[PDB]
């Protein structure tokens, strides 16, 4: 097809050096499945529109689609699965600037409901760290020290949205070079692991240390910040009512 061919070649340029030929082939062969899912989400009207968007790198959606996409986020909250190592760097590494997420650029999240539907079995037990690594298309063994989770609760998510702080990823913000349009993550031939994708404001963790947090997480299971201080897109610090939780995922 004309647009899919143009998509194929645009991919070959922006993909980074260390994306295997196998994964890249997988990205090429599954491309239409991800176009169709975006069309059925009414993220775009057609395959063509989706491929033109990937090629143009302008990830621009109708505001009505984004408002409908957010409903499940307002209902259940937002989730960001992380490794232990990446968690500690948010608190301990000074060049990480004591924020969770890339400061004013935000944190990639999915809906909390989508991660509970997917990372747990039918009976609600956490899946193995192997499965979850595979679902999230991260390197083998990345979560062997446990699967940690950031959680914006429903109130925090509604109040963040009232402020107009929820963002959709753009073609130049999103897998590193495997990003696709449609507010959706790319997940291989197993398209059932594709979750919605949005960008939430970063969390300020000024004067907090990973020691205390991880200690609290072994004690209670989670560390929590009542009414946390988020980082608005303009770089400001601003306090928003709600609960932001950090936790180690547990059956």
């Amino acid at each position: 097809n004309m647009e899919r061919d143009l998509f194929e070649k645009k991919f070959k340029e922006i993909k980074d050096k260390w994306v295997t030929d196998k994964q890249a082939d997988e990205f090429i062969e599954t491309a239409d499945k991800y176009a169709d899912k975006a069309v059925q989400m009414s993220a775009v009207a057609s395959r063509a529109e989706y491929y033109r968007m990937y090629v143009s790198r302008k990830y621009h959606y109708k505001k009505e689609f984004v408002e409908k996409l957010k409903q499940v986020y307002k209902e259940s909250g937002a989730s960001h699965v992380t490794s232990k190592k990446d968690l500690m760097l948010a608190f301990d590494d000074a060049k990480r600037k004591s924020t969770i997420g890339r400061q004013e650029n935000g944190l990639f999240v999915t809906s909390f409901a989508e991660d509970m539907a997917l990372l747990f079995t039918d009976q609600g037990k956490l899946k193995s760290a192997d499965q979850i690594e595979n679902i999230k298309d991260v390197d083998s063994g990345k979560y062997s020290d446990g699967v940690y989770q950031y959680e914006y609760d429903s109130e925090l998510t509604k109040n963040i949205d009232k402020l107009g702080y929820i963002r959709t990823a753009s073609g130049d913000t999103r897998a590193n070079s495997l990003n696709i349009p449609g507010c959706q993550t790319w997940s291989g031939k197993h398209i059932e692991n594709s979750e919605s994708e949005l960008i939430f404001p970063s969390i300020s963790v000024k004067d907090l240390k990973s020691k205390a947090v991880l200690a609290e997480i072994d004690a209670k299971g989670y560390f929590e910040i009542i009414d946390p201080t988020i980082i608005a897109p303009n770089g400001d610090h601003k306090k928003v009512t709600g609960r932001f939780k950090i936790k180690k995922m547990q059956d």
Partner: protein, 455 residues
């Protein structure tokens, strides 16, 4: 004087009365009891049943040319069974005939001294006109012999109505090819109205009908054999016949019922059948009328039971074997196929997810086909996104072939509770195949709701 020879030699004739006038229909060959055919968005399932008819009418139909009459002599052969009999014309002794018109007393019986076709016909014409002039005013019973049948084949409708099918197709119009395809359903009804009957005494001995001049070799020259023994025409009925054809293109199961009711005079389910049906009435001599109003038909039937100088016509006769004076019957044996049809239309499942939760569907259905023997062949199908998580505003269209059945649709949503991880919102078996199967889910995680509605 060859009387004793005619008697002895006819008596020696050796045949089976049933088989010598047997009429055998062609025997249905290889055929599939169920066929499935896919056109566009349609699935047509043809269904066939093989049926048998065994009748032995003793009133034989008359075509038109006929030179059959009371006391005629004929050959019991193939051509008799096809209403085109072979006469045996020799010289004849005097023969008494009797008409049954009322009020005539001894004038109803006369003796024709040379009982050829011309002479008997003239004697009857004299009887009938004398009755018109001096007896019709001051004495007539209506005698109507009525038959109805769906039409499935030439042989079948011939047996069923006791009427030569060529005359039916000639006067009406029977499309057997369309009937076989399941495209036309046809009923035919025959009103035989007898105004009078002329009868002819049975000869005490076979030779008695023959002049003393006649020899058995003269009879063998004329066709008499064990293969075609002689027949004496004992009765002929005169009157008029009215043929009624009810034709439709509906595949409804009640077309026969709707058709019988219209004929029966039975006075709105049938209105769908009857408004899209066509009606043909023929009065034989051919006063033919086609119409979509059935009263016009009823009017034709009522306006043609009138007997005056419109005369009556030979319409049927009864014969005996000369050797025996036993009534000769014609055994019709044939196979035919009753053909039904049903048309199904493809549909579409329209999924719309407007809830606040993560949902999943399980959508299953079967697709039916028929092998070369007409046995079902179930192909299980399943939606390829079954069990995939969905969030609002997801929506999609799942096409279903016209041959789908056993449609099962389940939508569930992830409550995420320690005791209730997934909750069902919609759980439906035997979903109706319709042009639109609209599957909506909505609500909140704790209070979800949905429905399947059809359009």
């Amino acid at each position: 004087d060859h009387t004793e020879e005619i008697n002895d030699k006819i008596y020696s004739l050796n045949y089976n009365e049933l088989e010598v006038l047997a009429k055998n229909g062609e025997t249905i060959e290889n055929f599939v009891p169920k066929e499935g055919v896919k056109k566009a968005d349609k699935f047509i399932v043809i269904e066939r049943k093989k049926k048998n008819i065994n009748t032995t009418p003793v009133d034989i139909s008359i075509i038109d040319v006929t030179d059959t009459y009371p006391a005629a002599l004929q050959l019991a052969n193939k051509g008799f069974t096809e209403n085109k009999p072979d006469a045996v014309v020799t010289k004849r002794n005097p023969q008494k005939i009797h008409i049954d018109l009322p009020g005539m007393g001894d004038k109803a019986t006369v003796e024709v001294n040379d009982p050829t076709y011309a002479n008997v016909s003239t004697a009857i014409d004299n009887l009938v006109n004398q009755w018109h002039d001096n007896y019709s005013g001051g004495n007539l019973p209506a005698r109507t012999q009525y038959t109805e049948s769906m039409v499935y084949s030439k042989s079948q409708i011939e047996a069923a109505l006791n009427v030569n099918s060529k005359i039916l197709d000639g006067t009406l119009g029977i499309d057997f090819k369309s009937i076989s395809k399941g495209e036309k359903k046809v009923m035919i009804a025959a009103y035989k109205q007898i105004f009078y009957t002329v009868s002819a005494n049975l000869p005490n001995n076979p030779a008695d009908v023959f002049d003393k001049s006649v020899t058995f070799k003269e009879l063998q020259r004329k066709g008499v054999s064990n293969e075609a023994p002689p027949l004496f025409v004992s009765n002929v009925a005169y009157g008029r016949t009215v043929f009624v054809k009810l034709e439709t293109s509906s595949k409804s199961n009640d077309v026969e019922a709707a058709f019988s009711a219209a004929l029966k005079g039975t006075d709105g389910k049938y209105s769908d059948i009857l408004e899209n049906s066509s009606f043909t009435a023929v009065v034989l001599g051919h006063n033919k009328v086609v119409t979509k109003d059935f009263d016009v038909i009823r009017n034709v039937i009522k306006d043609n039971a009138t007997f005056s100088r419109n005369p009556a016509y030979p319409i049927s006769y009864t014969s005996v074997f000369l050797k025996n004076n036993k009534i000769a019957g014609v055994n019709n044996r044939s196979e035919y196929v009753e053909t039904t049809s049903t048309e199904y239309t493809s549909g579409k499942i329209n999924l719309s997810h407007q809830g606040a939760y993560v949902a999943q569907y399980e959508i299953l259905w079967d697709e039916i086909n028929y092998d070369d023997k007409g046995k079902e062949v179930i192909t299980k199908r399943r939606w390829d996104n079954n069990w995939y998580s969905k969030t609002s505003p997801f929506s999609t269209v799942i096409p279903l072939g016209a041959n789908s059945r056993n449609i099962r649709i389940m939508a569930r949503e992830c409550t995420g509770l320690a005791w209730e991880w997934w909750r069902k919102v919609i759980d439906e078996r035997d979903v109706k195949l319709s042009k639109e199967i609209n599957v909506n889910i909505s609500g909140s995680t704790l209070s979800p709701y949905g429905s399947i509605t059809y359009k």
